[PDB]
């Protein structure tokens, strides 16, 4: 290969600056969006002393007495109790309801014996027991979620529980996309003479949209220097990132390479990876450019391992955009050639002991695309490693939602 994935990745990310332009949106429209500013809680949580469960609000003296305590009233979720609450009585209280003024403890239903003249308290009652104190979870003025946090079902409902109806989020990353080659036809059109249906562009479009990006699909550009320069000029003026799905040079000498070098500072890398290897990256006037190789498997893997992380950083997200890996045993013999980090496709599954093991999807050649559908993970074989025998330990990276489940 030559340059390592790690090097290229580090090179790309170190040059990129996260977006800062922001917009404020209602919570229901924030899924997947990146918080632009810290969320600081405006109130204490919980908001008022409340009951840990359904039972009775009591006072230590009354319990001590020993005689049953008549119910003087109740406290429900929607309506607290503002009655009088005289000595010798207890107050019926529901889970989550505000404890009444003067409440010194709450005992659960199960520890109370119903009596003829009030309720009996069987168990011992400790001071302050089962009373959720206001502010014991989140304190006002506190930072609940930091800027750069990707909003999900885990966070948005918490933000709503604080009374906040909208939050500022980084604007979506805008990505321009196009391919080129008179050999490319649009599905639905007839294939003529060694022609093929354009597929990489569809693949990148789908992935970009699932990643939450705004996509500007310029379609298939005709094989002409002027048409190509025009696409680049418009793409660069409307997006933060411009992606060539295939057709533009990733190293080979041709008119597209000349246009590339004239329009920006682009590097033509040769990565020590498989499948794939070539990749063009650099700065255009107002955007970043990522050039993908023509082979479908190669373009997909390159986009998935290189472009995806660049997009995560640009978005303002302070976390990685790729799944974590884990050590697993292979149930398949794997053909691997030293020299390249090989992202093979595999099938992660539980064996008899509920143990996780990986199997190969089959032929790992880049002449077919079916391994992405047949598998559910990448078997990331180390650069220097050679063939792998059944039973050996191997690193596995599960496919994220782009390839579904």
């Amino acid at each position: 290969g030559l340059m390592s994935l790690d090097t290229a990745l580090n090179e790309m990310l170190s040059r990129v600056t996260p977006l800062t332009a922001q917009e404020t949106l209602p919570l229901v429209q924030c899924f997947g969006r990146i918080l632009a500013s810290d969320v600081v809680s405006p109130l204490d949580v919980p908001g008022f002393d409340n009951s840990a469960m359904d039972g009775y609000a009591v006072r230590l003296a009354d319990i001590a007495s020993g005689q049953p305590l008549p119910v003087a009233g109740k406290s429900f979720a929607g309506q607290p109790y503002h009655g009088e609450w005289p000595a010798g009585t207890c107050i019926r209280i529901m889970w989550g309801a505000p404890v009444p003024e003067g409440c010194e403890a709450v005992v659960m239903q199960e520890q109370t014996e119903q009596m003829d003249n009030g309720v009996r308290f069987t168990a011992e009652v400790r001071s302050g027991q089962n009373i959720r104190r206001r502010g014991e979870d989140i304190s006002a003025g506190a930072v609940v979620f930091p800027a750069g946090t990707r909003l999900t079902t885990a966070e948005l409902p918490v933000i709503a529980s604080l009374g906040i109806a909208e939050v500022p989020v980084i604007r979506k990353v805008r990505v321009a996309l196009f391919s080129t080659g008179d050999e490319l036809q649009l599905p639905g059109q007839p294939l003529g003479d060694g022609q093929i249906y354009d597929t990489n562009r569809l693949a990148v479009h789908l992935m970009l949209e699932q990643l939450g990006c705004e996509v500007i699909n310029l379609g298939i550009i005709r094989d002409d220097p002027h048409a190509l320069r025009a696409a680049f000029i418009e793409a660069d003026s409307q997006a933060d990132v411009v992606i060539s799905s295939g057709g533009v040079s990733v190293g080979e000498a041709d008119y597209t390479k000349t246009i590339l070098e004239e329009l920006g500072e682009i590097a033509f890398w040769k990565l020590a990876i498989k499948p794939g290897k070539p990749f063009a990256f650099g700065k255009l006037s107002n955007s970043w450019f990522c050039g993908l190789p023509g082979n479908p498997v190669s373009a997909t893997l390159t986009f998935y391992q290189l472009v995806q992380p660049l997009l995560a950083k640009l978005s303002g997200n302070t976390a990685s955009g790729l799944p974590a890996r884990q050590r697993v045993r292979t149930a398949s013999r794997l053909k691997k050639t030293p020299g390249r980090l090989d992202f093979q496709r595999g099938v992660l599954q539980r064996n008899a002991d509920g143990e996780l093991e990986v199997t190969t999807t089959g032929h790992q050649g880049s002449h077919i695309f079916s391994s992405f559908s047949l598998g559910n993970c990448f078997i990331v074989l180390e650069r220097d490693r050679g063939n792998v025998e059944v039973g050996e330990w191997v690193e596995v990276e599960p496919f994220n939602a782009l390839f579904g489940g």
Copy 2:
């Protein structure tokens, strides 16, 4: 406890009938959609026999001699070789190029040494070797993807490569959603007297949209028998599933329960799960009803483990809608009470040996929602299990995209 998750799940799914209404859409709009009919390939892929690698095309004959055969021709990517093939030579050929008529085998250029007057073929040759036959990848008339398949980046580009521009997909499942309770306020509004901000509805809405459903959010219904009946009537008439985010009875006696029993055949279950337990399920006139408990953690877990799978079946998807589990060691002591299947929240991570282990998120009480954000998985503790000590084996279910994973 009482009824097991498995029983309830089985009960729910066995009564549900997958949707069949369909619509035809361009590929770029099909991510996450369910194929309504099998996709049958209209053409061969590859359309002809081609070379499995760079090398030479030959026939046993010329190789049986054991003499060096001189290069008569060359077959390239889209540049085949046709005409005369001297009964004593071999043809140069490139990976993916069309083998010439009467070609018996392809030989990798590495097993041949150019002998300044011909080509010597080192290792013996096994007929048919390195020849990829037409229809080998996909044969016309063959089923490429079956109905019920969830379309993803793994499938759509394959469909496009066959020249198909659009495919029929099951229509989206329509889901009606609402909550009730004069205690509920809308974030942005002031909180008055034991009132709280509605949060479950936002949670369910977010999850429904990420699951690809069409959401009809009827907001907060006023605490009135007539308003409630009106919401149900309209929800049932527009959706396939109606969900109560909180406020409608899940067992407790009240006017909402009466309206429920009058509008449909609803069962009030008590599941042996934690958090949660209550759940209302049944048939309305033209839709299915799912009633969630008021506690945020309880509603979320119940929706995630019960409603999510029901939606997957209704959608026409022939696969499960929940992630698989795996056996892992705990690095935390876990408090667990026999009697309920406990879906605790945990943090899956790699240790020193690159080994995967789980840690608790902290307090597992349902009085806080932060465990969903702090964790990345559920530690599914068996119903009969008790406390768990560090080092014990435990089942773990990674959070899907609804929560960030």
